[PDB]
Design a protein around this ligand. Structure first.
Ligand SMILES: NC(=O)C1=CN([C@@H]2O[C@H](COP(=O)(O)OP(=O)(O)OC[C@H]3O[C@@H](n4cnc5c(N)ncnc54)[C@H](OP(=O)(O)O)[C@@H]3O)[C@@H](O)[C@H]2O)C=CC1
Length: 387
């Protein structure tokens, strides 16, 4: 068993420099981690649109040219590369899982001295791996990012977290507040969520030492509202994919999905990060609105997919018979449908709506058109079968 109370520690060298900058209006040099991933591609695009800064992107790879091509191909898959200015993209070859982010002395020192703000979005998101395996990327990597931001000149870190650090609701029916206790780690169902919980706790120590660190706890991210571009391996779309594959759905089974478009998340995080009086605070990004499971099924039926209603046993035997995206998620699908309110605790977002007042930034409505864009993206990219 992991002693999670002992895992909450920040190396004593991670402390504010003599100069501490708490805002980053009009930044000139930005460090972004996780730019070769889903949210990171949209964070990169939005920083291009909302600053004039060069964006140093920490990317793993053999050499800068190969890392650049990885970053590019990811952005092209999400259909945002055309919105990015490559002349403002600077690849920083490194690794969240190794000391000083895998940088050499010259690069570490130069970024520590000159980056105006850090968006710490990179992490290893694996729903099964144990905490011990994810610690280096997700916890120690966060400590290393904090080390870099703090050293020489202290600049703000904007850390992407998850509403999953909560173990359900504090008081029934009361939306979870940004100040509410999280964890305990042992109550969280995955090593991944436990690693994010530890990172947050490490960040609380940094905050207690005077280091400027904002935290954005994000819920499930769905595709962008323009092209529908979305990662493939999340519970929502694998659930719907499984139903499509099984060509059926269990009778009398209802649930919901709180979809949060990725381009809302990127715009919100970057937008809040410039709003006044937000540095050092924690924010919840969560869509109060949802699409019911029955709504998704009806929408898929209207697109031409065969989804016959069958008894639970017949359905689960189809799913467990092989080649079905839901098979490893059957337990989660059953928990979500049998106690949906328990599965999706209410989340308070008032601080988030207030900070975004007047920014033009808002969650899109979950329309039929939006849903159809989502399915169309997966069908074109080969992730969903055609109807
Ligand atoms: N539904 C969601 O997607 C949600 C996401 N989040 C948070 O969003 C952030 C983005 O995750 P998401 O975009 O979803 O997942 P992705 O897997 O798409 O992005 C993960 C990113 O982390 C980077 N990364 C992982 N390990 C390392 C490493 N050792 N060294 C350097 N870079 C590394 C990956 O780089 P490479 O390409 O080299 O793997 C990739 O750029 C994460 O902090 C996650 O916790 C929170 C809540 C919900």
């Amino acid at each position: 068993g992991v002693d999670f109370a002992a895992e909450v520690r920040l190396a004593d060298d991670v402390r504010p420099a003599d100069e501490v900058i708490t805002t980053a209006a009009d930044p000139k040099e930005i460090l972004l981690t996780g730019a070769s991933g889903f949210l990171g591609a949209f964070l990169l695009r939005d920083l291009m649109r909302t600053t004039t800064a060069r964006v140093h992107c920490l990317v793993r790879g053999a050499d800068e040219a190969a890392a650049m091509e990885r970053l590019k191909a990811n952005a092209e898959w999400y259909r945002v590369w055309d919105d990015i200015d490559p002349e403002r993209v600077s690849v920083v070859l490194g690794d969240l899982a190794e000391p000083r982010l895998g940088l050499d002395e010259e690069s570490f020192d130069a970024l520590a001295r000159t980056v105006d703000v850090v968006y710490h979005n990179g992490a290893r998101v694996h729903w099964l791996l144990p905490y011990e395996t994810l610690k280096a990327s997700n916890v120690t990597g966060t400590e290393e990012v904090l080390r870099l931001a703090a050293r020489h000149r202290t600049v703000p870190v904007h850390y992407v977290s998850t509403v999953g650090v909560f173990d359900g609701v504090r008081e029934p029916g009361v939306p979870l507040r940004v100040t509410d206790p999280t964890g305990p780690a042992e109550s969280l169902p995955s090593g991944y969520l436990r690693s994010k919980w530890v990172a947050e706790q490490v960040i609380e120590v940094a905050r207690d030492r005077g280091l400027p660190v904002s935290v954005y706890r994000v819920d499930v991210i769905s595709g962008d509202r323009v092209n529908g571009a979305c990662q493939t391996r999340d519970f929502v779309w694998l659930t719907l994919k499984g139903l499509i594959q099984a060509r059926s759905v269990p009778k009398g089974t209802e649930g919901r999905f709180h979809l949060l478009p990725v381009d809302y998340v990127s715009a919100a995080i970057t937008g809040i990060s410039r709003q006044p009086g937000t540095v050092g605070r924690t924010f919840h990004l969560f869509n109060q609105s949802s699409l019911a499971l029955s709504q998704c099924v009806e929408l898929l039926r209207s697109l031409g997919y065969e989804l016959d209603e069958v008894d639970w046993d017949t359905w689960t035997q189809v799913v467990t018979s092989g080649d079905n995206a839901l098979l490893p998620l059957l337990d989660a699908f059953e928990m979500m449908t049998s106690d949906t309110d328990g599965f999706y605790p209410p989340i308070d977002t008032a601080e988030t709506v207030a900070a975004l007042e007047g920014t033009g930034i808002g969650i899109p409505v979950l329309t039929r058109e939006l849903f159809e864009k989502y399915v169309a993206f997966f069908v074109e990219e080969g992730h969903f079968p055609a109807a």
